[PDB]
Amino acid sequence: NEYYV
Amino acid sequence: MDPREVILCKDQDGKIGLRLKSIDNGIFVQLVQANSPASLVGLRFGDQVLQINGENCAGWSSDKAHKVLKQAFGEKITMTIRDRPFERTITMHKDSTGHVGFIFKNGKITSIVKDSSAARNGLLTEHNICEINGQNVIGLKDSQIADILSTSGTVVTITIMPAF
């Protein structure tokens, strides 16, 4: 997974 | 700017809680075990090691660097250190949606979102995230880093380093 932040 | 000296104590197997990496013919701190002597003297990921017991680290492999620590005589090891030579700091502002404007995975920035504060501030990809608003995030999972960013107020100040 990734995390747009 | 200048190098500081540190003095650490070994455990029984002669260890200090430190893994090192060879990069551009210098030696750099790659891992620092929790509650180790390395940790206590403030060594972090990205610190450059110039000397171990007065002996220059230049050109050494990490295997050589570790060997020199394991075979070092006595109870104290001295190191001469340059604090993260590669570290930079970027301050961003969350927009309306509460985002600063980048994608990350495994502590590395992988994409910059168009016309966000991360874009305006020239945040770069292929860079590890070291700290967010004082909080060290090296050795944390992506979810803990995303939660640190969430409860953050508007100003988000990250230190980064090129992955290298």
UniProtKB/Swiss-Prot annotation, chain B:
Residues annotated as binding a 1,2-diacyl-sn-glycero-3-phospho-(1D-myo-inositol-4,5-bisphosphate): 106, 141-142
Annotated GO MF terms: cytoskeletal anchor activity; frizzled binding; identical protein binding; interleukin-5 receptor binding; phosphatidylinositol-4,5-bisphosphate binding; protein heterodimerization activity; protein sequestering activity; syndecan binding
Domain PDZ: 5-84, 89-164
Native source organism of the sequence: Homo sapiens (Human)
Modification comment: Phosphorylated on tyrosine residues.
Gene Ontology terms describing biological process: actin cytoskeleton organization; chemical synaptic transmission; intracellular signal transduction; negative regulation of receptor internalization; negative regulation of transcription by RNA polymerase II; positive regulation of cell growth; positive regulation of cell migration; positive regulation of cell population proliferation
Subcellular location field: Cell junction, Focal adhesion; Cell junction, Adherens junction; Cell membrane; Endoplasmic reticulum membrane
Keywords for this protein: Acetylation, Cell junction, Cell membrane, Cytoplasm, Cytoskeleton, Endoplasmic reticulum, Lipid-binding, Membrane, Nucleus, Phosphoprotein, Repeat, Secreted
Membrane topology: Peripheral membrane protein
One term under GO cellular component: membrane
Tissue: Expressed in lung cancers, including adenocarcinoma, squamous cell carcinoma and small-cell carcinoma (at protein level). Widely expressed. Expressed in fetal kidney, liver, lung and brain. In adult highest expression in heart and placenta.
Record's note on what induces expression: By IFNG/IFN-gamma in melanoma cells.
UniProt name for this protein: Syntenin-1
Function, in words: Multifunctional adapter protein involved in diverse array of functions including trafficking of transmembrane proteins, neuro and immunomodulation, exosome biogenesis, and tumorigenesis. Positively regulates TGFB1-mediated SMAD2/3 activation and TGFB1-induced epithelial-to-mesenchymal transition (EMT) and cell migration in various cell types. May increase TGFB1 signaling by enhancing cell-surface expression of TGFR1 by preventing the interaction between TGFR1 and CAV1 and subsequent CAV1-dependent internalization and degradation of TGFR1.
Subunit structure: Monomer and homodimer. Interacts with SDC1, SDC2, SDC3, SDC4, NRXN2, EPHA7, EPHB1, NF2 isoform 1, TGFA and IL5RA. Interacts with NFASC and PTPRJ. Interacts with SDCBP2. Interacts with PDCD6IP. Forms a complex with PDCD6IP and SDC2. Interacts (via C-terminus) with TGFBR1. Binds to FZD7; this interaction is increased by inositol trisphosphate (IP3). Interacts with SMO.
SS bond list: none
